[PDB]
Write a protein that binds this DNA or RNA. Structure first.
Ligand SMILES: Nc1nc2c(ncn2[C@H]2C[C@H](O)[C@@H](COP(=O)(O)OP(=O)(O)[C@H](F)P(=O)(O)O)O2)c(=O)[nH]1
Ligand SMILES: [Cl-]
Ligand SMILES: [Cl-]
Ligand SMILES: [Cl-]
Ligand SMILES: [Mg+2]
Ligand code: NA
Ligand code: NA
Ligand code: NA
Length: 326
DNA sequence: GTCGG
DNA sequence: GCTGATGCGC
DNA sequence: CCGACCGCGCATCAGC
């Protein structure tokens, strides 16, 4: 929060470029800059000082100068007048409404929350649930509730089959005092990169979590990625807990360490890590790390036996989860 | 928007 | 149906 | 300059 004014401005420019401009590389460029500035341990006192950080160039440099002078950015102040872009910015906050869908709706005069509640007949399934719980999904989750939710999930998974292993990742695994949502990695020994010895492996888990009314809704659901809603249960005559987004990813047991690296994040850390893999001649995904040949075709899975082996392959010394929150 | 080649 | 492209979100 | 910018699961759509 040392440069909180600057990083907010860049995050607002990043969401603008992403939601309105549909310019995904400007969005990342602003995010990376927001990120390197966020971890810089001095109160930034000029744009040129900031341009010294990789990912701050000339244009962000001018903007930081202006912000530091007036406490505002005109480019932003305008963008908020523009009713079309503030309408688009708003609709994208409903889960399942992305930049294209938002601009489409706006083009039909569906611009506000009341607009969306009239026209649920014009929303796919994900969008329906995203509007249903629109408010709940912007509340964070206190870590103590993450700990409750963890316990239900791990105990309920233990009851389906004692050989499941469920790890909660995301910001929770990075030590966060709060989390936007819950991310669960699931492994079962009969699902490997070699065979799928048992069917409905993930389905059994969500079915059981539904049985105890922890999972309340589904956004999408395949045989390895579930994406939906959960809610802690409350005792007698207390206000309901909010509903929470939950994602569960079934990863092959022998690919646990790439899987847990991917799901621990952050997304930006993942991005910077995989990028630097490429400059060392590796490609990292949630399953494997492989070398690149001279043609750039991915070779075959290098053998991994811990998170740290992946970091070793690519010239980085290990970084504990709590230091991956870029 | 920023970077490295 | 299947395959491939896109949208969306991770 | 200027070309590349992580990698992929699920839903949904178009074409065959
Ligand atoms: N390679 C890659 N990985 C990505 C990307 N987006 C999310 N992820 C990853 C890493 C997350 O932590 C993880 C969960 O995705 P997430 O959106 O729940 O992020 P998170 O780190 O848990 C947030 F801090 P929180 O939700 O707690 O507020 O999945 C991406 O664009 N590329
Ligand atoms: Cl772009
Ligand atoms: Cl792979
Ligand atoms: Cl840690
Ligand atoms: Mg999360
Ligand atoms: Na720089
Ligand atoms: Na959205
Ligand atoms: Na998530």
């Amino acid at each position: 929060t040392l440069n909180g004014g600057i990083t907010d401005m860049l995050t607002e420019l990043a969401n603008f470029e992403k939601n309105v401009s549909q310019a995904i590389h400007k969005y990342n460029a602003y995010r990376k800059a927001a990120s390197v500035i966020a971890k810089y341990p001095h109160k930034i006192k000029s744009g040129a000082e900031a341009k010294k950080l990789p990912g701050v160039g000339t244009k962000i440099a001018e903007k930081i100068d202006e912000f530091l002078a007036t406490g505002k950015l005109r480019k932003l102040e305008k963008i908020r007048q523009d009713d079309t872009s503030s309408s688009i910015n708003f609709l994208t906050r409903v889960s399942g409404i992305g930049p294209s869908a938002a601009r489409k709706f706006v083009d039909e005069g569906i611009k506000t929350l009341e607009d969306l509640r009239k026209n649920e007949d014009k929303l796919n399934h994900h969008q329906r649930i995203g509007l249903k719980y629109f408010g709940d999904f912007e509340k964070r989750i206190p870590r103590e509730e993450m700990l409750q939710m963890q316990d239900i999930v791990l105990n309920e998974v233990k009851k389906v089959d004692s050989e499941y292993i469920a790890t909660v990742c995301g910001s929770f695994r990075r030590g966060a005092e709060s989390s936007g949502d819950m991310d669960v990695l699931l492994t079962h020994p009969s699902f490997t990169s070699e065979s799928t010895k048992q069917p409905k492996l993930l389905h059994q888990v969500v079915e059981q979590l539904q049985k105890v009314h922890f999972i309340t809704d589904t956004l999408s659901k395949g045989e390895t990625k579930f994406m939906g809603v959960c809610q802690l249960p409350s005792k007698n005559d207390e206000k309901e807990y909010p509903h929470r987004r939950i994602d569960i990813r079934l990863i092959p047991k022998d690919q646990y360490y790439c899987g847990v690296l991917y799901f621990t994040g952050s997304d930006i850390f993942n991005k910077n890590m995989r990028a630097h893999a490429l400059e060392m001649g590796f490609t990292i995904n949630e399953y494997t790390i492989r070398p690149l040949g001279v043609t750039g075709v991915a070779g075959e899975p290098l053998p991994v036996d811990s998170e740290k082996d992946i970091f070793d392959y690519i010239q980085w010394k290990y970084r504990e989860p709590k230091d991956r929150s870029e």
